Design a binder for this molecule. Structure first.
Ligand SMILES: COc1cc(C(=O)N2CCC(N3CCN(C)CC3)CC2)ccc1Nc1ncc2c(n1)N(C1CCCC1)c1ccccc1C(=O)N2C
Length: 125
């Protein structure tokens, strides 16, 4: 099988706006995670063909990655911050579903998730 198309990063039917919280998700949260030593597996959609994972998109039907999130934020795709937080949580949960506890990539996702939650908590009033 082919790869699926990547998640949409624009949608002409979906109202969109910029908010202070979404600006913070791009300029602080995404930027901090993107620069982390463990970011690289998450910077683009899973290429199941190149990785020889014919079952990845049989198991993972809601894919997400930080390249898609970065584009969504840059494109002002979202209406609210909780939508974008959900995209990060989908990305982490996918890793935990396909892999097993204690696997290398799971420890990498767990470290990024800890940092993600710290940066969200630091959002100033
Ligand atoms: C461009 O994408 C990749 C490149 C590579 C790769 O071989 N390289 C070459 C070495 C590069 N490093 C050079 C040294 N640098 C210090 C770090 C980068 C990193 C990219 C491996 C996996 C890649 N993709 C990938 N994406 C997502 C993965 C995953 N792999 N992995 C790998 C599992 C351990 C690390 C990533 C997965 C493999 C099987 C099942 C699931 C996963 C998974 O859950 N995720 C999140």
């Amino acid at each position: 099988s082919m790869n699926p198309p990547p998640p949409e990063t624009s949608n002409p039917n979906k109202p969109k706006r910029q908010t202070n919280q979404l600006q913070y998700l791009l300029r602080v949260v995404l930027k901090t995670l993107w620069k982390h030593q463990f970011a690289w597996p998450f910077q683009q959609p899973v290429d199941a063909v190149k990785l020889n994972l014919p079952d990845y998109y049989k198991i993972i039907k809601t894919p997400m990655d930080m390249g898609t999130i970065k584009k969504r934020l840059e494109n002002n795709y979202y209406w609210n911050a909780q939508e974008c937080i959900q995209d990060f949580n989908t990305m982490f949960t996918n890793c935990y579903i396909y892999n097993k506890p204690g696997d290398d990539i799971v420890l990498m996702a767990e470290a990024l998730e800890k940092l993600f939650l710290q940066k969200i908590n630091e959002l100033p009033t």
